Amino acid sequence: STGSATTTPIDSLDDAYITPVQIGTPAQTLNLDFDTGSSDLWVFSSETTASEVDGQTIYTPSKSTTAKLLSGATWSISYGDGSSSSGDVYTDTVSVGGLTVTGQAVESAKKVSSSFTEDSTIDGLLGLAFSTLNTVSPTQQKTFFDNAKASLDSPVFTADLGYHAPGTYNFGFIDTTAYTGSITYTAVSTKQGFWEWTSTGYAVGSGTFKSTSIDGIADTGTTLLYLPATVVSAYWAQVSGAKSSSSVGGYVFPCSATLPSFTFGVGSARIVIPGDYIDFGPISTGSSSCFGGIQSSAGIGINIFGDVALKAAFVVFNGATTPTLGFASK
Ligand SMILES: C[C@@H](C(=O)O)N(C)C(=O)OCc1ccccc1
């Protein structure tokens, strides 16, 4: 089997991408944030505290003839940005782009933190990291991909995120028309539960490539590119007037600037992030100061190849026995 679904930016900055997901019978379609940095499929629901729902579409398990409460199971998750959610668990039929999994754990939110409430466009998350990170207790549950992978034509999914435009998540096949030149694969460590890999270095604009190992995670659920402070300083030094602001929470730059590209290495291959992809717009409405798309990871504990990096590539998440990542230009 295969599936293919369009993923759409939630706003004009590509802050996140939503993908329609069919849950239950008859289908209830919710727009979920596909997150290769986490492993829970959770949704706003009829059980979510009413004051914490503000425009999201909800899953109502009582209206699904295939929903079954997973007795005794609870979940609770906290994300790197400080947001969180928790609740109970149903199993139900879940389909993405024509690919159907029966008995998928659908984690129904009883509580969500304010950042989720305040974003009416995201109805939940669909985790695509390794199932070892799933938070369901006392019986950990499998991700959608883990449940589907034995049925897929090939045990892979691909992320093809658009710049200020829709893109595609495919399951079970590699669309050879969706990229240019060849797919360069690299080794993954699953020891922390992430799609963790080592970039071979970077370049700023037309500058020389610096060969240096940068361990990080491929994370579709993170907006920006978080890299070591040395790398980030080297990038922003090429932008007149750019500085790190403790007040704002990162590097800012004149909105009048033309940003240089940023290149990262994948083995001997190179992925070029155009400068425009690094512009996240005014820090506040009407400000002439803009928020950078490359930021320091120093306070995180891990480097994160988020959407800024991934949307410059066609990315293969190879979930074979010995997992790997592939990157192609497009
Ligand atoms: C030969 C290899 C390399 O980079 O040395 N290469 C080009 C390549 O794509 O290797 C990807 C891979 C990593 C780990 C396990 C299986 C496959």
Coordinates of C-alpha atoms and ligand atoms in Angstrom, one line a residue:
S1 CA 0.0 0.0 0.0
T2 CA 0.9 3.7 -0.3
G3 CA -0.5 7.0 0.8
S4 CA -0.1 10.6 -0.4
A5 CA -1.4 13.7 1.3
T6 CA -0.9 17.4 0.7
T7 CA 0.6 19.5 3.5
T8 CA -0.3 23.2 3.7
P9 CA 1.4 26.0 5.6
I10 CA -0.8 27.4 8.4
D11 CA 0.2 31.0 7.7
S12 CA 2.2 33.3 5.5
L13 CA 5.5 32.5 7.3
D14 CA 5.3 28.7 7.1
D15 CA 5.2 28.5 10.9
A16 CA 3.9 25.0 10.6
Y17 CA 2.2 22.7 8.1
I18 CA -1.1 20.9 8.4
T19 CA -2.1 17.7 6.7
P20 CA -5.7 16.3 6.6
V21 CA -6.2 13.0 8.5
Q22 CA -9.4 10.9 8.5
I23 CA -10.2 9.5 11.9
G24 CA -13.1 7.1 12.7
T25 CA -16.2 5.8 11.0
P26 CA -17.7 7.8 9.4
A27 CA -14.5 9.8 8.9
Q28 CA -13.8 12.9 11.0
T29 CA -11.2 14.9 9.1
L30 CA -8.8 16.8 11.3
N31 CA -5.8 18.9 10.2
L32 CA -2.8 17.6 12.0
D33 CA 0.8 18.8 12.4
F34 CA 3.0 15.9 11.2
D35 CA 6.0 15.9 13.6
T36 CA 9.1 13.8 12.9
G37 CA 10.3 15.0 16.4
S38 CA 7.6 13.3 18.5
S39 CA 5.7 10.0 18.6
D40 CA 2.2 10.7 19.8
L41 CA -0.9 11.1 17.6
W42 CA -3.1 13.4 19.7
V43 CA -6.2 15.4 18.8
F44 CA -8.5 18.1 20.1
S45 CA -11.6 16.2 21.1
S46 CA -15.0 16.3 22.7
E47 CA -13.2 15.7 25.9
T48 CA -11.0 18.7 25.7
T49 CA -11.7 21.3 28.4
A50 CA -14.1 23.7 26.7
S51 CA -12.3 26.9 27.5
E52 CA -9.1 25.4 25.9
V53 CA -10.8 24.9 22.5
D54 CA -10.9 28.0 20.3
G55 CA -11.8 27.2 16.7
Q56 CA -10.2 23.8 16.3
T57 CA -12.0 20.8 14.8
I58 CA -12.5 18.1 17.4
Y59 CA -12.6 14.4 17.3
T60 CA -15.8 13.0 18.9
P61 CA -15.1 9.3 19.6
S62 CA -18.8 8.6 20.6
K63 CA -19.7 9.4 17.0
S64 CA -17.3 6.8 15.5
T65 CA -18.5 3.3 15.3
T66 CA -14.9 2.0 15.2
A67 CA -13.6 3.9 18.3
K68 CA -12.8 1.9 21.4
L69 CA -11.6 3.3 24.7
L70 CA -8.1 1.9 25.5
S71 CA -8.9 1.1 29.1
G72 CA -6.7 2.7 31.7
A73 CA -4.4 4.4 29.2
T74 CA -3.3 8.0 29.6
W75 CA -0.8 10.3 27.9
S76 CA 1.0 13.5 28.7
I77 CA 3.6 15.2 26.6
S78 CA 5.7 18.4 26.8
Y79 CA 7.4 19.8 23.8
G80 CA 10.7 21.6 23.4
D81 CA 8.9 25.0 23.1
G82 CA 7.3 24.6 26.5
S83 CA 3.8 23.6 25.2
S84 CA 2.1 20.5 26.5
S85 CA -1.1 18.4 26.4
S86 CA -2.5 15.3 28.0
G87 CA -5.6 13.0 28.1
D88 CA -6.9 9.5 27.5
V89 CA -6.7 7.1 24.6
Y90 CA -8.9 5.5 22.0
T91 CA -8.1 3.1 19.2
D92 CA -9.7 3.9 15.9
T93 CA -9.2 3.7 12.1
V94 CA -6.9 6.4 10.8
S95 CA -6.2 7.2 7.2
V96 CA -3.7 9.6 5.6
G97 CA -3.8 10.2 1.9
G98 CA -5.5 6.9 1.2
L99 CA -3.4 4.8 3.5
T100 CA -5.4 3.2 6.3
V101 CA -4.4 1.9 9.7
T102 CA -6.9 0.1 11.9
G103 CA -6.5 0.1 15.6
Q104 CA -4.3 3.2 15.7
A105 CA -3.9 4.8 19.1
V106 CA -5.7 8.2 18.9
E107 CA -4.8 10.2 22.0
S108 CA -7.7 12.4 23.0
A109 CA -6.8 15.7 24.7
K110 CA -8.4 16.5 28.0
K111 CA -6.0 19.4 28.5
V112 CA -3.9 21.5 26.1
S113 CA -1.5 24.4 26.9
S114 CA -2.3 27.9 25.8
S115 CA -0.2 27.9 22.6
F116 CA -2.3 25.0 21.2
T117 CA -5.6 26.8 22.2
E118 CA -4.4 30.0 20.5
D119 CA -3.7 28.3 17.2
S120 CA -7.0 27.5 15.7
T121 CA -5.4 25.9 12.5
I122 CA -3.8 22.9 14.2
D123 CA -6.2 20.2 15.4
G124 CA -3.5 18.0 16.9
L125 CA -0.2 16.3 16.1
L126 CA 0.8 13.1 14.2
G127 CA 4.1 11.9 15.5
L128 CA 6.6 10.3 13.1
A129 CA 9.6 9.8 15.4
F130 CA 10.4 6.4 16.8
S131 CA 7.7 4.7 18.9
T132 CA 10.1 4.5 21.9
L133 CA 9.2 8.1 22.6
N134 CA 5.4 7.5 22.7
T135 CA 4.0 8.8 26.0
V136 CA 1.0 6.5 26.5
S137 CA 1.0 4.8 29.9
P138 CA 1.0 2.0 31.1
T139 CA 1.3 0.4 27.6
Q140 CA 3.3 2.4 25.1
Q141 CA 1.6 2.7 21.7
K142 CA 3.0 2.7 18.1
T143 CA 3.1 5.6 15.7
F144 CA 1.0 5.7 12.5
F145 CA 4.0 4.9 10.5
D146 CA 5.1 2.0 12.7
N147 CA 1.6 0.5 12.4
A148 CA 1.5 1.0 8.6
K149 CA 5.1 0.0 7.7
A150 CA 4.6 -3.7 7.2
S151 CA 1.8 -3.0 4.7
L152 CA 3.7 -0.4 2.8
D153 CA 5.3 -1.1 -0.6
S154 CA 8.5 0.2 0.9
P155 CA 9.0 1.0 4.6
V156 CA 9.6 4.7 4.0
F157 CA 7.9 8.1 4.2
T158 CA 8.9 11.3 2.5
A159 CA 8.6 15.0 3.4
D160 CA 8.4 17.5 0.6
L161 CA 7.6 20.8 2.4
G162 CA 6.9 23.9 0.3
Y163 CA 8.3 27.4 0.7
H164 CA 5.2 29.6 1.1
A165 CA 3.3 26.9 -0.7
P166 CA 1.8 23.4 -0.2
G167 CA 3.9 20.3 -0.3
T168 CA 3.5 16.6 0.1
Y169 CA 3.9 13.7 2.6
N170 CA 4.1 10.3 0.9
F171 CA 4.0 6.9 2.6
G172 CA 5.4 3.7 1.1
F173 CA 7.1 5.1 -2.1
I174 CA 9.6 7.6 -3.4
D175 CA 8.3 9.9 -6.1
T176 CA 11.2 10.2 -8.4
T177 CA 9.7 13.2 -10.2
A178 CA 9.7 15.3 -6.9
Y179 CA 13.4 16.0 -6.7
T180 CA 16.4 16.9 -8.9
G181 CA 19.8 15.1 -9.2
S182 CA 20.1 12.0 -6.7
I183 CA 18.9 11.2 -3.1
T184 CA 22.0 11.1 -0.8
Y185 CA 21.4 8.8 2.2
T186 CA 23.0 9.1 5.7
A187 CA 23.1 7.1 8.9
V188 CA 20.7 7.6 11.6
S189 CA 21.0 7.0 15.3
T190 CA 17.7 6.0 17.0
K191 CA 19.3 6.0 20.5
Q192 CA 17.3 9.2 21.5
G193 CA 14.2 8.2 19.6
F194 CA 14.7 10.8 16.9
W195 CA 15.8 10.8 13.2
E196 CA 19.2 11.9 14.4
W197 CA 22.0 12.2 11.8
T198 CA 25.3 14.0 11.3
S199 CA 25.6 16.8 8.7
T200 CA 29.1 17.1 7.2
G201 CA 29.3 20.9 7.4
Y202 CA 28.0 24.3 6.2
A203 CA 28.6 27.3 4.1
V204 CA 27.3 30.9 4.4
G205 CA 26.2 32.5 1.1
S206 CA 28.9 32.1 -1.6
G207 CA 31.5 31.4 1.1
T208 CA 33.8 28.4 1.3
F209 CA 32.3 25.2 2.7
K210 CA 33.4 24.4 6.3
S211 CA 33.8 20.6 6.8
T212 CA 32.6 19.9 10.4
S213 CA 30.3 17.2 11.9
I214 CA 27.0 18.6 13.1
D215 CA 24.8 16.1 14.9
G216 CA 21.1 17.0 14.8
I217 CA 17.6 15.8 14.2
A218 CA 15.3 16.0 11.2
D219 CA 12.2 17.6 12.8
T220 CA 9.2 18.6 10.6
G221 CA 7.5 19.8 13.8
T222 CA 10.0 22.6 14.5
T223 CA 9.8 25.8 12.4
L224 CA 13.4 27.0 12.5
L225 CA 16.9 25.7 12.0
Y226 CA 18.8 25.5 15.3
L227 CA 22.6 25.1 15.1
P228 CA 25.7 25.6 17.2
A229 CA 26.3 29.2 18.3
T230 CA 29.6 29.3 16.3
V231 CA 27.7 28.4 13.0
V232 CA 24.8 30.8 13.7
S233 CA 27.2 33.7 14.5
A234 CA 29.0 33.1 11.3
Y235 CA 25.8 33.3 9.3
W236 CA 24.4 36.5 10.9
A237 CA 27.8 38.2 10.7
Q238 CA 27.1 38.4 7.0
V239 CA 23.9 40.5 7.6
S240 CA 24.5 44.1 8.3
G241 CA 22.7 45.1 11.5
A242 CA 21.8 41.6 12.6
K243 CA 22.3 40.9 16.3
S244 CA 21.2 38.5 19.0
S245 CA 18.6 40.0 21.3
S246 CA 18.0 38.4 24.7
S247 CA 14.7 40.4 25.0
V248 CA 13.2 39.1 21.8
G249 CA 14.7 35.5 22.2
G250 CA 17.2 35.2 19.3
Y251 CA 18.8 36.8 16.3
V252 CA 17.0 39.8 14.6
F253 CA 18.0 41.7 11.5
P254 CA 16.8 44.7 9.5
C255 CA 13.7 43.8 7.5
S256 CA 15.4 45.8 4.7
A257 CA 18.2 43.2 4.5
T258 CA 18.7 40.7 1.7
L259 CA 19.7 37.5 3.4
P260 CA 22.4 35.2 2.2
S261 CA 21.8 31.5 1.6
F262 CA 22.9 28.8 4.0
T263 CA 24.2 25.5 2.8
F264 CA 24.4 22.3 4.8
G265 CA 26.2 19.1 4.0
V266 CA 24.7 15.6 3.6
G267 CA 27.6 13.3 3.0
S268 CA 29.4 14.8 0.0
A269 CA 26.1 16.5 -1.2
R270 CA 25.0 20.0 -0.4
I271 CA 21.5 21.4 0.3
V272 CA 21.1 25.1 -0.3
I273 CA 18.6 27.1 1.8
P274 CA 17.8 30.3 -0.1
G275 CA 18.1 33.5 1.9
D276 CA 14.4 34.2 1.7
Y277 CA 13.6 31.0 3.6
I278 CA 15.4 32.5 6.6
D279 CA 13.2 35.5 6.9
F280 CA 10.4 35.1 9.5
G281 CA 9.0 38.6 9.3
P282 CA 8.5 41.4 11.7
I283 CA 9.2 40.6 15.4
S284 CA 5.8 42.5 16.1
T285 CA 3.3 44.0 13.6
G286 CA 4.7 47.0 12.0
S287 CA 8.3 46.6 13.3
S288 CA 11.3 47.2 10.8
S289 CA 13.2 44.5 12.8
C290 CA 12.7 40.9 11.5
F291 CA 13.1 37.4 13.3
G292 CA 15.8 35.1 11.9
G293 CA 15.2 31.6 10.7
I294 CA 18.6 30.3 11.9
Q295 CA 19.0 30.4 15.6
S296 CA 21.3 29.0 18.2
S297 CA 20.7 25.6 19.7
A298 CA 22.9 26.4 22.7
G299 CA 20.0 26.4 25.1
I300 CA 18.3 23.3 23.7
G301 CA 20.8 20.5 24.0
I302 CA 20.5 19.2 20.4
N303 CA 20.7 20.7 17.0
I304 CA 17.5 20.8 15.1
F305 CA 17.1 20.7 11.3
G306 CA 13.5 22.1 11.3
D307 CA 11.3 23.2 8.5
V308 CA 13.7 26.0 7.4
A309 CA 16.2 23.3 6.4
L310 CA 13.9 20.5 5.4
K311 CA 11.7 22.6 3.0
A312 CA 14.9 23.2 0.9
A313 CA 15.0 19.4 0.3
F314 CA 13.1 16.3 -0.6
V315 CA 13.6 14.2 2.5
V316 CA 13.4 10.4 2.8
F317 CA 12.7 8.9 6.2
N318 CA 13.8 5.3 5.6
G319 CA 12.3 3.1 8.3
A320 CA 13.9 -0.2 7.3
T321 CA 15.5 -2.4 10.0
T322 CA 18.6 -0.2 9.9
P323 CA 17.0 3.2 9.6
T324 CA 18.5 6.0 7.3
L325 CA 17.8 9.6 6.0
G326 CA 17.9 10.7 2.4
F327 CA 18.2 14.3 1.1
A328 CA 17.8 15.5 -2.5
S329 CA 17.7 19.0 -3.9
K330 CA 14.4 19.9 -5.6
Ligands
LIG1 C1 28.4 4.5 1.0 C2 27.6 5.4 2.0 C3 28.6 6.4 2.6 O1 28.1 7.6 2.8 O2 29.7 6.1 2.9 N1 26.5 6.1 1.3 C4 26.8 6.8 0.1 C5 25.2 6.0 1.7 O3 24.3 6.5 1.1 O4 25.1 5.4 2.9 C6 23.8 5.5 3.5 C7 23.6 4.4 4.5 C8 24.0 4.7 5.8 C9 23.9 3.7 6.7 C10 23.4 2.5 6.4 C11 23.1 2.2 5.1 C12 23.2 3.2 4.1

